[PDB]
Amino acid sequence: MPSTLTINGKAPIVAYAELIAARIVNALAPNSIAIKLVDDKKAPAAKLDDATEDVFNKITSKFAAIFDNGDKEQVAKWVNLAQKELVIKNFAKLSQSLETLDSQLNLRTFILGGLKYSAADVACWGALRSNGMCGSIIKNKVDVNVSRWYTLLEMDPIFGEAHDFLSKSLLELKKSAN
Amino acid sequence: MSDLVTKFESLIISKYPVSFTKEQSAQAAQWESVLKSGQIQPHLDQLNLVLRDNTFIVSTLYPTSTDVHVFEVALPLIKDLVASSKDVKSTYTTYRHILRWIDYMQNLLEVSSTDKLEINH
Numbered sequence: 498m499p500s501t502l503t504i505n506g507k508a509p510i511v512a513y514a515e516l517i518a519a520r521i522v523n524a525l526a527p528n529s530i531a532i533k534l535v536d537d538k539k540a541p542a543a544k545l546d547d548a549t550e551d552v553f554n555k556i557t558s559k560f561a562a563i564f565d566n567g568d569k570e571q572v573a574k575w576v577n578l579a580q581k582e583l584v585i586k587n588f589a590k591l592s593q594s595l596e597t598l599d600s601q602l603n604l605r606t607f608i609l610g611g612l613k614y615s616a617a618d619v620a621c622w623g624a625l626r627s628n629g630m631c632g633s634i635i636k637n638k639v640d641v642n643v644s645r646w647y648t649l650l651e652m653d654p655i656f657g658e659a660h661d662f663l664s665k666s667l668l669e670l671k672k673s674a675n
Numbered sequence: 676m677s678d679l680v681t682k683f684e685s686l687i688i689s690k691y692p693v694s695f696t697k698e699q700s701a702q703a704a705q706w707e708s709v710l711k712s713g714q715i716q717p718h719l720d721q722l723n724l725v726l727r728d729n730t731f732i733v734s735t736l737y738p739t740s741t742d743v744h745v746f747e748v749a750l751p752l753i754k755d756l757v758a759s760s761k762d763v764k765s766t767y768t769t770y771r772h773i774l775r776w777i778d779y780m781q782n783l784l785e786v787s788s789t790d791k792l793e794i795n796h
Binding site: 644 | 794
């Protein structure tokens, strides 16, 4: 039987990274994780079974067959940034942080440099999706590389349709009542 | 029609599908006629602009054949000019987008010791 990832739709920062990790595992190893939605402002942004702290790590470590490439130590570096730095709605702070990424991506297609993405790419793209301040900074590309990178992953339905799944899900939550 | 077209189709992705917008069709158009004339080199600067915003030549999730045809003619011409560079570290900064594209595809198509390009980081 699966885990239950429960994510919250009224949350100020919506846990898109976690939704996207869950969808990857499901894509390769079907029924590994059940996704559950809950519209309610007194509720954590994400919950894996019981754990509320460190949920992304938990998913990522658990299914280590799917999450293997990239030097562990280094995936930690960029998961950190993502979680504690690319969420903040403060243009002065963001810009500095986006620059770090934009330099990292100079001679690269993916963050840690491989031929395919890693957990780092997930943590970051998710963070930037939740923080809607970043929408305008792209869309109109203050940091060229970051805009090129983000645009790529957007084309992958596991990433770029992550939003609809949520919209649809919350629609169904209102039906199942009401 | 050549060696690298083979090893691309040895790979899951040729494969498919696309695809193709009115935009994207006309894009891979001008990049094939560029090759027909023989005038790759004097369009490096365009290629670099294209590659600045788009990860692959025709704005696709994975490389298309165009991304290989062009790469075949591009790879030598780039690495030649990295030799003849005086600053290079200009060249690098001047052509960093063609450079990350190369670096991707030369590993995707398993080019030999050879052949392959330095790539510093």
